[PDB]
Design a protein around this ligand. Structure first.
Ligand SMILES: *[C@@H]1O[C@H](CO)[C@@H](O)[C@H](O)[C@H]1NC(C)=O
Ligand SMILES: *[C@@H]1O[C@H](CO)[C@@H](O)[C@H](O)[C@H]1NC(C)=O
Ligand SMILES: *[C@@H]1O[C@H](CO)[C@@H](O)[C@H](O)[C@H]1NC(C)=O
Ligand SMILES: *[C@@H]1O[C@H](CO)[C@@H](O)[C@H](O)[C@H]1NC(C)=O
Ligand SMILES: *[C@@H]1O[C@H](CO)[C@@H](O)[C@H](O)[C@H]1NC(C)=O
Ligand SMILES: *[C@@H]1O[C@H](CO)[C@@H](O)[C@H](O)[C@H]1NC(C)=O
Ligand SMILES: *[C@@H]1O[C@H](CO)[C@@H](O)[C@H](O)[C@H]1NC(C)=O
Ligand SMILES: *[C@@H]1O[C@H](CO)[C@@H](O)[C@H](O)[C@H]1NC(C)=O
Ligand SMILES: *[C@@H]1O[C@H](CO)[C@@H](O)[C@H](O)[C@H]1NC(C)=O
Lengths: 295, 295, 295
């Protein structure tokens, strides 16, 4: 009887799909989380120089978005005065071509009606600004902090589902591996960049962005012991760089050390969805099923 | 037949409203995004002083919330010792009125049972703290970094819808305009403050907060080429200021340069809603429609 | 009549539960918020030292996650050179046990094939790094900034519901109390730590994390004057610490002041749910009710 067949197909639709498969009896809720990150590693740059956590992590106190320096270019002992600007901003020969005002595309200062020597043969437009000017860009290759590949990331996380009042936490040697140590919160940087689909050598010489996700997909009808985190690594490359300066005083004069920092930016996002049996969606689904069953 | 009329009105309700208008056949999902911001600009303050990106952007590495300084008040060469406090904290004449302990409403240090001169005629309570004390507030008018009006904001954004596994990115001269260049990720600061409904002159002399929103309202039944971002500027004024210090050492003594920074705070929020046809909501809606159709 | 009874029980289910209790006629929406925080307080540490807001708040400009220092350990005048490492890293007696390379678990530098004296009796492995090495950990007890208990937190908040286009803001003496001053945005630190279920003395000597939540549960069918914020304090302890350095130049040599900062981390999360009567959920619920009523 075709009526019996259509009744059966509608019935199997509701029970087999809405409830068994899509869990129509459940209601989704969000979570609130806190993430803490600790960096373990040392680097040597060549006199010889050593970089500690207080030096290669931005910001110091930590944040969901933080940068780990992998390479840099330093312009030291930079004061404020009159100096020749970069020749890429324009090579001049006579004072007629030096119009006072503002530069563009890399403006290092305010120009002036004067031409001064740059490298004993070319004459560039004189500027007022932070002098001496930032040296022509020559990114070190290989990167200066190439040892960053072996630093470690200890990630602490504590979530809470406000709707169901459920809290969980993600916690003498261990390193994370996808199918060997799946529940080790300590990650090596080279592993994360490889898992994001990125070459750490290139991502160290220019910089890059690596996203980190902690998926707390939990079925609360089960135990809380089975509500575990799942880590996934995302490649969000054109590079990542920023400029920061260390200001100091010598002989009463204020100087600065300009750094152009190439580093890997890590973004940690915690998103999860939990469900629990409710009576409203069950009745809603069965009523819709009865309606379609009849029609 | 009134029964036919009510059948028609119920039917037009479901098809015409739930499905055609509110898209009852779709299911909403969230997104995960990463934002990167670059600042292009130079400023001159008067000896003459020049402010670079490493100097007027807080924090250096960048963040979804960042501040661009537009004005400041600097108390230089500030050491730790015994000095007269601000007369606004209380003008004294005799040691009897100087009770050692703690001040209030602007406490510059711990008091002591002594009165010392402040400006050769008034005698204020002696304190231990960072001396000399912060000079009386006189906000510069017009602002010192009044050239901030013409700086530019290059915004990078990359979103991803976890449910439908859809990723999108928002990307020789271009500046954003609302109905001229609607898809240019480079914004001039004075434009954003005007669009937020704010005067940049006042918002530069005191500070302020400007919110930036990137609405990725995308209908995934269409192409991904039509899933574009939409920028909206919000005015979230009492002002925005904060204090930060540059610490240095001279002759073995630690000093600091206290800055009171007035600047514009930019908050970037990425929120969007995407939909895709599903079978659960369609059946739910039609079942409810059959129920109401009959009753 | 049992049929009348089942009709009555189904009917009371829908009207009494979906609509009256769970507000099935409403539709939930999220919000976008901005938070600003101001710290009022002074501390004295013993020559005598005074800590201002520019010194004990990380970051300076402010952020939803910020740290207020409560205790610290400072290693001053730290240069780069050859020095004996910490004896906890290994006590040696002969050069045979000094293998050049890298240390572990606390690596202070790169070792070398040499043994040098540490405290005139033990000989430790010589390293290159930031010298002199960080002194053995002795956390001050009681904490150095023990006056942090009486600092204040002024919280500004401005929310907006994008769906219903509703904006709200949470705003000569006032301090917050749970059942005395419920709408005072100024919180004392010792109150927040007590409300989180934490001892401020211990949380000051090691550090800790305190979460702050602003629940904007608003029923938009009422007035907006009744859409008020609700503050809740969460205890998210193993402690919280980080390392940061102040770099300075003396006699042409770069030194640094390494700080190990123990402080309380405050996380502010703004989440709320607003509802407004809609026609889609009402019809959906009544259709499901008619379906179940019949079956
Ligand atoms: C001087 O700088 C100019 C910049 O265009 C460059 O072409 C030239 O080769 C430089 N000279 C030397 C000797 O480096
Ligand atoms: C990382 O460690 C491996 C040994 O496990 C070593 O071969 C490699 O050179 C190290 N990389 C760096 C750059 O420190
Ligand atoms: C990519 O990584 C491989 C090692 O996995 C290396 O051999 C290769 O040189 C890298 N490519 C670039 C462009 O650096
Ligand atoms: C000295 O300071 C007091 C502060 O109340 C002020 O009234 C007075 O005018 C000042 N004197 C001078 C000469 O500035
Ligand atoms: C911004 O540029 C315009 C010209 O486009 C100029 O008139 C104005 O003075 C500039 N503003 C500042 C303060 O730099
Ligand atoms: C507001 O902006 C206008 C220019 O658009 C300017 O003329 C006016 O002085 C500004 N108002 C204040 C109070 O600065
Ligand atoms: C020297 O350091 C070692 C480290 O193990 C310690 O055992 C010893 O007591 C110290 N000596 C003195 C005099 O502090
Ligand atoms: C906080 O204030 C109370 C008085 O209200 C005082 O007893 C207490 O010692 C203060 N705590 C600190 C450490 O400043
Ligand atoms: C906890 O706080 C109480 C005061 O409320 C104090 O007496 C006690 O010593 C504290 N406990 C610790 C371990 O510091």
């Amino acid at each position: 009887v075709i009526f019996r067949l259509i009744q059966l197909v509608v019935l199997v639709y509701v029970i087999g799909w809405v409830f068994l498969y899509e869990k129509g009896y459940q209601t989704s809720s969000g979570l609130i989380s806190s993430v803490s990150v600790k960096l373990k590693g040392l680097a040597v740059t060549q006199g010889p120089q050593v970089w500690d956590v207080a030096d290669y992590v931005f910001p110091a106190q930590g944040d969901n978005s933080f940068v780990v320096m992998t390479n840099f270019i330093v312009t030291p002992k930079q004061t404020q005065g009159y100096c020749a600007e970069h020749p890429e901003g324009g090579i001049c020969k006579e004072d007629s071509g030096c119009t006072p005002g503002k530069a563009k595309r890399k403006a290092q200062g305010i120009r002036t009606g004067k031409c001064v020597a740059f490298n004993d043969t070319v004459k560039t437009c004189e500027i007022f600004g932070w002098c001496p000017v930032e040296v022509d860009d020559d990114i070190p290759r290989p990167a200066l902090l190439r040892e960053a590949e072996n630093f470690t990331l200890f990630i602490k996380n504590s979530i809470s589902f406000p709707r169901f009042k459920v809290n969980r936490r993600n916690l003498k040697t261990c390193l994370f591996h996808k199918t060997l140590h799946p529940l080790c919160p300590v990650f090596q940087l080279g592993y994360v960049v490889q898992e994001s689909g990125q070459n750490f050598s290139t991502l160290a010489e220019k910089g890059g962005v690596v996203g980190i996700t902690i998926d707390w997909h939990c079925d609360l009808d089960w135990h809380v012991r089975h509500c575990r985190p799942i880590y996934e690594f995302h490649g969000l490359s054109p590079g990542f760089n920023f400029r920061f300066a260390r200001h100091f005083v010598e002989n009463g004069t204020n100087y600065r050390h300009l750094f152009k920092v190439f580093g890997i930016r890590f973004d940690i996002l915690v998103d999860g969805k939990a469900g629990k049996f409710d009576i409203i969606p069950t009745m809603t689904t069965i009523g819709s099923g009865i309606g379609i069953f009849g029609v």
